Amino acid sequence: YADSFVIRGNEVRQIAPGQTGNIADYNYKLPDDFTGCVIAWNSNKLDSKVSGNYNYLYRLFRKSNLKPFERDISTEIYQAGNKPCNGVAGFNCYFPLRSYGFRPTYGVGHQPYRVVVLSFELLHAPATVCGPKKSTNLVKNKCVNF
Amino acid sequence: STIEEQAKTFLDKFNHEAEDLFYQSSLASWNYNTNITEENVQNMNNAGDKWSAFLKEQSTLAQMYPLQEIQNLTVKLQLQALQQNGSSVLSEDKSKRLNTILNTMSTIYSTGKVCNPDNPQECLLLEPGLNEIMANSLDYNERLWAWESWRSEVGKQLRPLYEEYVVLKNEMARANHYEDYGDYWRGDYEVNGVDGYDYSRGQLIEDVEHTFEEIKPLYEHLHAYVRAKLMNAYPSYISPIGCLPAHLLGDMWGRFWTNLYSLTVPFGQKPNIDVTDAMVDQAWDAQRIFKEAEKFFVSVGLPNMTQGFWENSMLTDPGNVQKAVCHPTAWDLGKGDFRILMCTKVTMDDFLTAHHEMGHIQYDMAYAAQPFLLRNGANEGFHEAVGEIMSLSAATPKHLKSIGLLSPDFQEDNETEINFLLKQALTIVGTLPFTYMLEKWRWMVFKGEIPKDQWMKKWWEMKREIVGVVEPVPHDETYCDPASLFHVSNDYSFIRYYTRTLYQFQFQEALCQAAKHEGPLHKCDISNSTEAGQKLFNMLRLGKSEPWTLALENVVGAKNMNVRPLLNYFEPLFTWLKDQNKNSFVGWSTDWSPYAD
Ligand SMILES: *[C@@H]1O[C@H](CO)[C@@H](O[C@@H]2O[C@H](CO)[C@@H](O)[C@H](O)[C@H]2NC(C)=O)[C@H](O)[C@H]1NC(C)=O
Ligand SMILES: *[C@@H]1O[C@H](CO)[C@@H](O[C@@H]2O[C@H](CO)[C@@H](O)[C@H](O)[C@H]2NC(C)=O)[C@H](O)[C@H]1NC(C)=O
Ligand SMILES: *[C@@H]1O[C@H](CO)[C@@H](O[C@@H]2O[C@H](CO)[C@@H](O)[C@H](O)[C@H]2NC(C)=O)[C@H](O)[C@H]1NC(C)=O
Ligand SMILES: *[C@@H]1O[C@H](CO)[C@@H](O[C@@H]2O[C@H](CO)[C@@H](O)[C@H](O)[C@H]2NC(C)=O)[C@H](O)[C@H]1NC(C)=O
Ligand SMILES: *[C@@H]1O[C@H](CO)[C@@H](O[C@@H]2O[C@H](CO)[C@@H](O)[C@H](O)[C@H]2NC(C)=O)[C@H](O)[C@H]1NC(C)=O
Ligand SMILES: *[C@@H]1O[C@H](CO)[C@@H](O)[C@H](O)[C@H]1NC(C)=O
Numbered sequence: 123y124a125d126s127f128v129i130r131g132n133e134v135r136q137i138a139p140g141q142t143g144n145i146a147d148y149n150y151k152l153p154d155d156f157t158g159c160v161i162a163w164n165s166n167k168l169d170s171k172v173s174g175n176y177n178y179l180y181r182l183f184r185k186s187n188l189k190p191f192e193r194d195i196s197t198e199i200y201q202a203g204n205k206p207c208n209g210v211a212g213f214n215c216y217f218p219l220r221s222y223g224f225r226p227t228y229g230v231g232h233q234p235y236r237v238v239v240l241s242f243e244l245l246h247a248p249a250t251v252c253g254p255k256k257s258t259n260l261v262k263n264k265c266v267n268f
Numbered sequence: 269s270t271i272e273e274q275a276k277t278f279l280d281k282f283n284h285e286a287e288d289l290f291y292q293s294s295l296a297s298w299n300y301n302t303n304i305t306e307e308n309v310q311n312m313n314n315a316g317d318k319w320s321a322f323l324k325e326q327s328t329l330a331q332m333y334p335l336q337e338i339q340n341l342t343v344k345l346q347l348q349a350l351q352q353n354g355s356s357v358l359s360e361d362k363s364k365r366l367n368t369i370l371n372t373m374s375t376i377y378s379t380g381k382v383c384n385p386d387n388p389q390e391c392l393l394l395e396p397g398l399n400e401i402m403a404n405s406l407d408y409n410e411r412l413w414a415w416e417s418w419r420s421e422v423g424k425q426l427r428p429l430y431e432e433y434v435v436l437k438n439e440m441a442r443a444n445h446y447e448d449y450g451d452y453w454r455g456d457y458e459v460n461g462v463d464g465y466d467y468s469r470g471q472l473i474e475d476v477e478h479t480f481e482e483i484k485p486l487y488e489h490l491h492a493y494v495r496a497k498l499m500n501a502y503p504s505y506i507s508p509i510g511c512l513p514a515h516l517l518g519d520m521w522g523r524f525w526t527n528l529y530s531l532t533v534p535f536g537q538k539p540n541i542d543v544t545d546a547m548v549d550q551a552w553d554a555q556r557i558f559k560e561a562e563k564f565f566v567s568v569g570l571p572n573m574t575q576g577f578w579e580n581s582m583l584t585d586p587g588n589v590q591k592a593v594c595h596p597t598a599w600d601l602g603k604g605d606f607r608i609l610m611c612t613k614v615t616m617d618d619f620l621t622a623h624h625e626m627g628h629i630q631y632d633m634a635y636a637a638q639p640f641l642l643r644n645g646a647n648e649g650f651h652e653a654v655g656e657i658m659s660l661s662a663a664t665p666k667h668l669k670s671i672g673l674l675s676p677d678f679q680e681d682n683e684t685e686i687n688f689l690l691k692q693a694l695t696i697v698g699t700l701p702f703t704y705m706l707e708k709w710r711w712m713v714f715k716g717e718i719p720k721d722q723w724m725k726k727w728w729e730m731k732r733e734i735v736g737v738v739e740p741v742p743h744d745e746t747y748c749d750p751a752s753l754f755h756v757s758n759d760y761s762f763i764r765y766y767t768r769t770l771y772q773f774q775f776q777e778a779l780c781q782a783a784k785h786e787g788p789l790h791k792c793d794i795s796n797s798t799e800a801g802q803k804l805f806n807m808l809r810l811g812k813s814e815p816w817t818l819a820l821e822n823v824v825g826a827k828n829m830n831v832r833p834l835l836n837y838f839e840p841l842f843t844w845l846k847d848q849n850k851n852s853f854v855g856w857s858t859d860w861s862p863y864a865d
Contacts, residue, residue, distance in 0.1 A: 202277045229604030
């Protein structure tokens with residue numbers, strides 16, 4: 123499995139088994155027995171456009187934290203107070219999605235980073251695909267270990 | 269929904285939005301400041317408008333959460349800072365009246381024009397030339413003219429406006445459970461219920477009047493020296509038991525005696541330390557000086573520059589005609605995007621100003637992790653305090669001869685040291701009596717003790733009693749002298765320049781007692797040490813998240829400002845002044861007058 127997204131700079135420390143924070147809590151939760159492989163790099167010059175690039179959102183309100191590898195895309199208005207909201211923003215009724223406003227004149231830790239994670243799992247299959255092998259010229263007419 | 273949830277879950281949202289918007293506003297502003305055009309003013313005014321409107325809406329909304337049901341300290345402090353009504357508690361028409369009186373006062377101060385009695389056609393503004401006439405001229409008549417004029421034309425217009433301004437501000441402050449306006453200023457040093465670190469609003473006056481008592485033994489001798497020296501340029505104009513005439517100090521109001529160094533130098537043939545030709549003979553650019561400053565800062569154990577600051581900042585003025593106000597400033601657009609705007613020249617004074625500004629840059633780099641509403645100094649004073657010690661430690665001869673700007677065999681002696689120390693004390697301990705006097709006068713007139721038909725008489729008797737200077741010309745009650753000072757006619761607090769002068773030397777001694785220095789404090793350096801950097805950085809990174817009386821005790825170890833480091837810094841100068849006054853008369857008698865003879 124291969125997951126990919128973009129996040130802020132100083133939050134890459136949260137794509138890791140057993141962490142917390144506004145991003146890793148409920149946007150993407152890696153389990154405690156992870157077996158994958160995390161890769162993450164800087165993509166300032168490709169995804170940041172002056173004046174604000176308001177496409178990438180990140181949830182920061184939810185009932186309870188997520189489950190590992192689960193996904194939640196709803197847009198139901200939060201409710202922190204005691205009075206039900208009836209779907210109108212304002213007092214104790216907050217929209218659950220904000221947007222990273224990226225710009226090229228940011229410091230490291232706020233420029234957009236791109237993160238990809240690999241995750242393996244071997245259900246029962248005994249042959250789904252092996253790794254890459256070596257290379258060389260098979261000699262001939264010699265007693266060899268092959 | 270624990271009655272506080274709305275407090276924490278509100279605060280978050282606010283945090284985010286706030287930060288973002290603010291940034292938009294600030295980028296906008298830096299723009300207009302570095303590239304003066306006609307459209308950029310519009311590009312920035314609407315950004316500032318949106319920011320102000322958003323903040324006032326959030327302030328009107330934050331009221332719905334009471335302030336006694338909060339239990340966590342940081343969220344309570346953030347709400348208490350945001351929940352402030354400020355103005356707009358008044359009647360609506362009175363609010364517009366207050367805006368008009370403030371703006372009219374500011375304008376009348378800014379565009380003042382005084383003209384000669386011998387030539388009333390073309391004449392002088394304040395900033396170009398009037399300061400030059402009051403600082404560099406040497407004839408009694410021209411100085412007396414330049415002094416009496418500005419207080420006869422800008423002091424007379426401002427009184428009938430200041431009268432209404434006082435009562436309007438008092439009626440404003442009296443709606444937020446305050447009793448006058450001065451208390452609404454002293455409210456910055458307030459700390460409530462932290463079990464011992466509390467600091468009542470009243471005790472600030474007590475400290476100030478308790479620390480001004482130990483300065484007088486030095487200020488008296490300095491006054492005696494400066495007076496017995498001024499008795500040479502103007503023979504038989506001063507009395508040896510009197511005070512000084514206000515128009516002989518060195519500027520319009522007598523705030524800095526620094527321009528008196530030309531008349532009162534102790535050893536007029538031993539030049540001070542000055543790296544100005546050695547710089548240009550080494551072909552130093554604006555890049556090299558900032559590289560030196562960053563190297564010094566990284567030597568003590570602080571981080572580098574953010575690598576986004578070398579491409580965005582404007583270190584040298586733009587070559588072509590690009591109007592950008594050349595006044596150094598350290599910008600913290602937030603989001604870790606720090607900048608420095610200053611028109612550097614190749615002069616050791618700019619070399620020290622670079623250090624003094626990168627001080628603010630480092631101090632802003634430290635606390636960038638706190639919530640957005642806590643991104644300031646501990647109070648109004650710590651900022652320039654922590655800034656200035658870098659300039660005080662980078663100007664010593666040791667740090668100079670360790671960078672390649674002084675000849676290695678340069679041998680310093682006590683004569684040059686006394687010269688440097690008097691050049692310093694003409695600015696540091698000179699402004700303190702004026703500052704304390706003006707601030708106490710303003711607190712008095714605000715609390716209502718001084719009836720509005722006794723303003724100028726009280727102000728002048730205070731100038732006679734405390735600071736030791738006397739007016740040259742009588743002034744009845746159609747005047748207002750204090751309204752002729754920039755920080756008064758523009759509604760600016762004026763006590764920070766008195767707490768900073770103490771915090772400065774407290775920080776200096778507290779820090780370089782960890783660098784294992786052994787000599788007098790005025791040669792002390794903080795280079796190559798790592799304990800000093802840690803002691804400083806364990807306070808730089810707090811911001812407002814802790815009461816300032818803890819930010820101090822984690823550096824020096826006390827819970828208040830103490831003047832003893834200042835005197836311990838000047839002890840050599842004091843030992844000299846105790847000898848150079850064996851024959852004069854220390855102090856002054858408040859009976860002498862320049863016109864009653
Ligand atoms: C300072 O501001 C002025 C006002 O916009 C800039 O002038 C124009 O800026 C636009 C912005 O892209 C350019 O497309 C034009 O070519 C500029 N024209 C002229 C005559 O300057 C100016 O460029 C700004 N200065 C800097 C250094 O950016
Ligand atoms: C409420 O107060 C507690 C401490 O009284 C705060 O706990 C600290 O929280 C920060 C991050 O928010 C952590 O880095 C610290 O380690 C915590 N301190 C301790 C001792 O664990 C808590 O943050 C406060 N609540 C809020 C919303 O700020
Ligand atoms: C700030 O100003 C308001 C008036 O605009 C003062 O009055 C409170 O206003 C809020 C909402 O506007 C009401 O919920 C309160 O009942 C009002 N009275 C109070 C709080 O006593 C408010 O008092 C001012 N703030 C402070 C700290 O005094
Ligand atoms: C600077 O130091 C020199 C030498 O340490 C001082 O010279 C002596 O000063 C004492 C002080 O009264 C005199 O009694 C001696 O006669 C001086 N030495 C000679 C050779 O004359 C000098 O006084 C110091 N500077 C100041 C301002 O005191
Ligand atoms: C104090 O800091 C200075 C600043 O870097 C260090 O200066 C170096 O000193 C050595 C020997 O004294 C010279 O060989 C280097 O050329 C100096 N560097 C520079 C940039 O001038 C000095 O080493 C530090 N003190 C100690 C004890 O390490
Ligand atoms: C600071 O920058 C210099 C570049 O000259 C580098 O050598 C040094 O390692 C940097 N130090 C830190 C703490 O980043």
